[PDB]
């Protein structure tokens, strides 16, 4: 399986890279604001913090609460930012989870396929062996 992980892994990490670096300077006014009462401020502060928080969005834990904690930013009619992060989390999570489970069950499929063709070839060889045993017996 991990040998078969060739291109999908770098596709996953490069989508992570592009989406994280896009979302760095999207909720910039979340961490860079003068609001005293906030507790998810550090999530969107640094580039490494951006990687960690978009990984959190990828894992999809408390995305509701993350969105309400970013709602303390002045709502600019949600025209670009909230739809961007929601689309990113949903698309990335479902597309990558689905693609990995699909390719893993495909790996199981061809494992069983090569196993079954091996037993079929063994059965064909056994039939040929038994037929040649009849041929040899009649040849004596």
């Amino acid at each position: 399986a991990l040998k078969s992980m060739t291109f999908l892994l770098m596709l996953l990490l490069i989508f992570f890279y592009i989406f994280a670096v896009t979302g760095v300077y999207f909720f910039r006014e979340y961490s860079r604001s003068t609001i005293e009462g906030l507790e998810y401020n550090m999530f969107f502060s640094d580039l490494l913090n951006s990687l960690v928080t978009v990984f959190i969005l990828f894992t999809l834990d408390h995305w509701y609460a993350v969105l309400q904690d970013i709602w303390k930013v002045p709502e600019s009619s949600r025209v670009f930012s909230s739809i961007y992060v929601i689309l990113w989390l949903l698309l990335g999570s479902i597309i990558f989870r689905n693609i990995i489970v699909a390719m893993m069950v495909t790996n199981f499929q061809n494992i069983r396929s090569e196993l079954s063709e091996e037993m079929s070839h063994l059965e064909v060889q056994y039939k040929a062996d038994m037929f040649k045993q009849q041929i040899i017996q009649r040849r004596q």
């Binding site: 063709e117 091996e118 070839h121 060889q125």
Partner: protein
Amino acid sequence: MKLTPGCFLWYLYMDKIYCLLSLRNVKALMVYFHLLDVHHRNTLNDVLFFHFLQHVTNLNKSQIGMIFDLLDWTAVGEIGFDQFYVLICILLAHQDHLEDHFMYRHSRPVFELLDLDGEMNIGAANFQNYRFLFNIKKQELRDLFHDFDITGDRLLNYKEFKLYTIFCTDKSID
């Protein structure tokens, strides 16, 4: 008798399967085997076999040990005189160009020498042992194995091996 009827028939088969039957080749092989076997107990030690191989063919120690292990099917730690004669006939001055065709012709069964497992299937380890015994390129051996493995299960049947040997002999003759 002329050194037993079994060896007489073996010499007759060798003369029928080879263009030249030489002169007292079996007698020279028996003399060398008697010289190697100090105790004359119809067996030779691994050290004596390695010394004889290094003195005659100048083979490597690992190659000599692998050849001795392949020849000693009984796994008793010793090599018999018949096994030593069979190995000498299989070598048959392997540096010669016609020796490659002689090895391609192999013997009457011409399958058990390659099939060390004996289950009518030759694996990658057996192919590597054959390529160590007789000089052949790794890429050429891989191509030959890929051509022989029609089913893709990496197993060589007796009929497929015989057909491949016949095709190789026909290509070499033509």
